[PDB]
Amino acid sequence: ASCETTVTSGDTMTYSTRSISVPASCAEFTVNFEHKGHMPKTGMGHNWVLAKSADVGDVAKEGAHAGADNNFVTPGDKRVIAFTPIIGGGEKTSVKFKVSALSKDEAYTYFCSYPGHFSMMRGTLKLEE
């Protein structure tokens, strides 16, 4: 469908894709996020969080202290452009954001903010005209 992608995860520290392109003719963009694990497992919860590449470390290290009830993202953090809740095996979620929040000229990284995952679990997002 036009302005959307699907990203999956499972019982590993990797997303299904390391690159996402957002068409600049979109007004809104939807990221569908699936966890293909079979059951909820310790240390295997995942989400999808978007920020400028320079902000990743700060957002994740601060977000870790937000707790599981806040989905490991600091409430109301302006560095976070969009995020999904933490999901476990068998679940799915979605986040829709405005394309006007993005800039060509800026560098973006999506990552998982479950404690410790952000180092390996990440990818690049680009606004493509």
- 112 touches Cu ion by CB under 5 A: yes
- 122 touches Cu ion by CB under 5 A: no
For 87, the 3-state DSSP assignment is strand
DSSP string over 41-70:
-TT--B--EEEEGGGHHHHHHHHGGG-GGG
Stretch near Cu ion under the rule CB under 5 A, chosen from 25-33, 83-91, 96-104, 121-129: 121-129
- 35 touches Cu ion by CB under 5 A: no
Query: What gap in Å lies between CA 55 and CA 122, rounded to an integer?
Result: 13
Closest distance to Cu ion from the beta carbon of 32 (Å): 16
Determine the length of the chain. 129
For 37, the 3-state DSSP assignment is coil
Query: What gap in Å lies between CA 88 and CA 86, rounded to an integer?
Result: 7
- 108 touches Cu ion by CB under 5 A: no
Q: Binder to Cu ion among 95, 117, 125, 127 (CB under 5 A)?
A: 117
Closest distance to Cu ion from the beta carbon of 47 (Å): 7
Residues that contact Cu ion, how many (by CB under 5 A): 5
| Contact set with Cu ion (CB under 5 A) | 46, 112, 114, 117, 121
